[PDB]
Amino acid sequence: SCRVLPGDAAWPSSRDWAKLNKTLNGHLIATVPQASVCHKSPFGQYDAQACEELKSSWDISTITHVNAPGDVLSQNFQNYSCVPFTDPSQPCQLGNYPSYVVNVTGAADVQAALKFAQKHNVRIVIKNTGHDYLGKSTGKGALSLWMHNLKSTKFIKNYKAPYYKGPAAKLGAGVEGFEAYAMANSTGHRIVGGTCPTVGIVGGYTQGGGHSILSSSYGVAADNVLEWEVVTADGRHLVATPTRNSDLYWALSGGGGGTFAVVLSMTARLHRDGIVGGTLLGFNDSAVGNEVYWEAVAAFHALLPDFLDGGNSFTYSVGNNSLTAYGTMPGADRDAVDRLLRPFLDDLASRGITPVVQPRVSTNYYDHFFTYLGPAPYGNAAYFPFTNSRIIPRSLVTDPKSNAVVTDLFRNISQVPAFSPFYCDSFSVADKPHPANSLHPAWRTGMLLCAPAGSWDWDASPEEMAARDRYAAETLQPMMDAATPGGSVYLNEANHLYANWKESFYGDNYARLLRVKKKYDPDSVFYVKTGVGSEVWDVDATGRLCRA
Ligand SMILES: *Cc1cc2c(nc3c(=O)[nH]c(=O)nc-3n2C[C@H](O)[C@H](O)[C@H](O)COP(=O)(O)OP(=O)(O)OC[C@H]2O[C@@H](n3cnc4c(N)ncnc43)[C@H](O)[C@@H]2O)c(*)c1C
Ligand SMILES: *[C@@H]1O[C@H](CO)[C@@H](O[C@@H]2O[C@H](CO)[C@@H](O)[C@H](O)[C@H]2NC(C)=O)[C@H](O)[C@H]1NC(C)=O
Ligand SMILES: *[C@@H]1O[C@H](CO)[C@@H](O)[C@H](O)[C@H]1NC(C)=O
Ligand SMILES: *[C@@H]1O[C@H](CO)[C@@H](O)[C@H](O)[C@H]1NC(C)=O
């Protein structure tokens, strides 16, 4: 059995879709890609100047793009079907985009869409922001549950349970980083969220784990979830906590989005705000030569433990001849910032390097975040659609023998132009209180999460971009894996073609994750590439989803 596609005898009629729309109170949207304004047909609405506006920031994570119902940010998944950078005469086609989008207002819209889809054998897709690097928030011929507009927030002053007492926030499924930060800040709190401000904090970010510059202080985003409000495949409106539907709670808190249930909201721990120490710390090989530069990168890595165990973090960009780091030091006044940086600066001084060091103390976390990752509120985060990753164990770094292999990996990757420079985050998320969840164990032993990320080139041919896609999956990622035994790959930052996904994403947790999948979705209504239980479905040459 296969899901239906447009053209099939069993594709729902115009009356069937109109019936669904009536049930949804007019909230069904026939998908019109945002870049239809760049083409004359089949939508008649070529607007040359509106098209130039889309070109200007198409490869950036913009609120304008995220606001579009049927769109996705990945240039690879757009796949030239309806894009700004082909000729106006080339027809705008849906390709990987869903055929219809449900503008979800609450639980009933989801229940009605699920029931319709099971009745008519339509593929369900779930999309929040369209950030997903693996194409998991789009799909050909699908009915998409668009969660973007569930923006409600609610401060809970005294959340009270065995697992947590303190302030919390209930956030709707569509709440993005910038909105969560604005809400948390308004009450003098912080929340654990991603570095890219348009990222959907309640969607794939937290559901897949979600690292943060506050992770050394408060753990992974998944660690901070108190409750998940969901709709199951069979339409049940449930709440999953550590003591209620707790197997579902466990799976949702790190098991990856788009497979266990449809999330309507989450409730997450808030944390007391206060001053935040910051710095730019940068150095290069210009005075001292490339070999010493790499020895300095290696020693920088080996000095991180004490810094990270104090609740602090570095997010840094590793280039072939220079490194630029951004330090986050919660509650560190100026004297304390200098004391925390001193070992790093003493080491660089002993190798002949004069670094660029620009410390600061921000009054609150919101200001700190947007000093380095702004401008507020939306940032300017570039979308690199060949994103790979590795969670690297501390033990690899602290043993200078295995750390030499790590440095050799970084040097090798630094020599590949499309994937260089690249960002790394650093964290210690062991030994903190959290409810039991399905985060890969590698997170706990982990110290670095590095994301070599290939850019898209609109002047290249489709075959060249396909070849880069394949290179990332079958050459670069396995090279990263072999250099970092004991690590894992972060399921949110990987290539859709990566063959070893099951082992690297889920490891020993897969058995239990799969039992939760089969319990809450026995008919496999939910599918995402590399998702738990995704092996039930296969995509054929046409993009049709068929049972394996
Ligand atoms: C684009 C981008 C992504 C980033 C950036 N920075 C990050 C960082 O500093 N740390 C991180 O840990 N991650 C970073 N990410 C990655 C994002 O965390 C992931 O790409 C998330 O998977 C994206 O989440 P979301 O914003 O929800 O994007 P979608 O593509 O809409 O969905 C992803 C995935 O999750 C499922 N899903 C979303 N919402 C739901 C609900 N309500 N219910 C069920 N399932 C849901 C989707 O089906 C899909 O599979 C920096 C940048 C620039
Ligand atoms: C972009 O579209 C092309 C087809 O126009 C897709 O090519 C298919 O790729 C798969 C492997 O992923 C092959 O096994 C199929 O034979 C190809 N199909 C055809 C018809 O050539 C390609 O997958 C699309 N890219 C993305 C990222 O969706
Ligand atoms: C659903 O109904 C609304 C309100 O009349 C309409 O604007 C919209 O175009 C309809 N959607 C579809 C897919 O027909
Ligand atoms: C989605 O629904 C909300 C609330 O009903 C509405 O404000 C918004 O304009 C809708 N979006 C689109 C694109 O129709």
**Where in the chain is CATH 3.30.465.10?**
153-273
Kindly give the distance from the C-alpha atom of residue 203 to the centroid of ligand 1, in angstroms, as a whole number.
6
Q: Which CATH number fits domain 153-273: 3.30.465.10, 1.10.3720.10, 3.40.640.10, 3.30.70.20?
A: 3.30.465.10
Pick the CATH number of 14-149+517-547 from 3.40.50.300, 3.40.50.970, 3.30.1490.190, 3.30.43.10: 3.30.43.10
User: Residue 216 C-alpha to ligand 2 middle, in angstroms?
Assistant: 41
Smallest CA-to-CA distance from 74 within 500, 504, 494, 541 is with 494
DSSP-derived secondary structure for 350-417: HTT---EEEEEEESSHHHHHHHHS-STTT---B--SEE--EEEEHHHHHSHHHHHHHHHHHHHHHTSG
Sole residue written with tokens 């239906």: 4
Report d(CA 198, CA 206) in Å as an integer: 14
For residue 79, give every residue at least 6 positions away whose Cβ sits within 8 Å of its Cβ, in sequence order, or none: 95, 96
Q: SS3 for 518?
A: helix
Measured from the Cβ of residue 69, the count of other Cβ atoms closer than 10 Å reads 22
CB contact at 8 A, 214 and 311: no
The C-alpha atoms of residue 25 and residue 177 are separated, in whole angstroms, by 29
CA 376 to chain centre: 19
CA of 128, closest atom in ligand 1: 31
SS3 22: helix
Q: Which two tokens stand for residue 236?
A: 């049940």
Spatial CA neighbour of 123 closest among 106, 139, 107: 139
Q: Is 316 left (phi over 0), alpha (psi -120 to 50) or beta?
A: beta
CA–CA separation, 328 vs 403, rounded Å? 24
Beta strands 271-272 and 189-190, pairing class: antiparallel
Contact between residue 224 and residue 432 where contact means Cβ atoms under 8 Å apart: no
Give distance in angstroms: CA of 8 to centre of ligand 2. 20
Please tell me the distance from the alpha carbon of residue 249 to that of residue 164, in angstroms, as a whole number: 15
Which residues of the chain does CATH 3.40.462.20 include?
A: 277-364+381-506
Which atom in ligand 3 lies closest to the alpha carbon of residue 30?
13
> Of 533, 487, 547, nearest to 255 (Cα)?
533
Q: Are 490 and 209 in contact (CB under 8 A)?
A: yes
Give the integer Cα–Cα distance in Å for 443 and 391: 7
How far apart CA 111 and CA 106 sit, in angstroms, is 9
Pocket test for ligand 3, best of 25, 28, 105 (most atoms within 8 A of CB): 28
Alpha helices in 187-289 (DSSP H): 206-207, 215-218, 246-252
- Ligand 1 test: best mutation among 191, 205, 534, most atoms within 8 Å of CB? 205
Residue 401: CB atoms within 10 A of its CB come to: 7
Mutation probe of ligand 1 site: the residue of 77, 104, 105, 207 with most atoms within 8 A of C-beta:
207
How far apart CA 415 and CA 520 sit, in angstroms, is: 46
Paired tokens of 444 = 């706990």
Q: How far apart are CA 436 and CA 434, in angstroms?
A: 7
Topology of domain 277-364+381-506 in CATH is Vanillyl-alcohol Oxidase; Chain A, domain 3 (3.40.462)
CA–CA separation, 143 and 540 (whole Å): 19
Tokens of 259: 């497979």
Question: N- to C-terminal Cα distance for the chain?
Answer: 9
Alpha-carbon distances of 405 from 122, 329, 483, rounded to whole Å = 48, 29, 6
Task: Report DSSP state, residue 426.
Answer: E
Which DSSP symbol is given to 476?
Answer: I
Q: Give the residue among 537, 496, 530, 493 at the shortest CA–CA distance from 513.
A: 530
Q: Are 190 and 271 in contact (CB under 8 A)?
A: yes
Provide Rg for the chain, Cα atoms.
23
Q: Could you tell me the sign of the dihedral formed by the alpha carbons of 485, 486, 491, 493, in that order?
A: negative
In whole angstroms, what is the distance from residue 540 CA to residue 258 CA?
Answer: 20
Give the sheet arrangement for strand 100-103, strand by strand: 28-30, 100-103, 143-146, 124-127
Distances (CA, A) of 113 to 28, 89, 104, 373: 10, 35, 9, 37
Query: Prior bond to 452 cis, omega within 30?
Result: no
- Contact 351/294 with Cβ under 8 angstroms? no
State if residue 30 touches ligand 3 by the CB under 6 angstroms criterion.
yes
CA of 28 to the centre of ligand 4 (A): 10
Judge whether 315 and 325 are in contact, CB under 8 Å: yes
Protein residues whose CB sits closer than 6 Å to any atom of ligand 4: 27, 69, 103, 105, 149
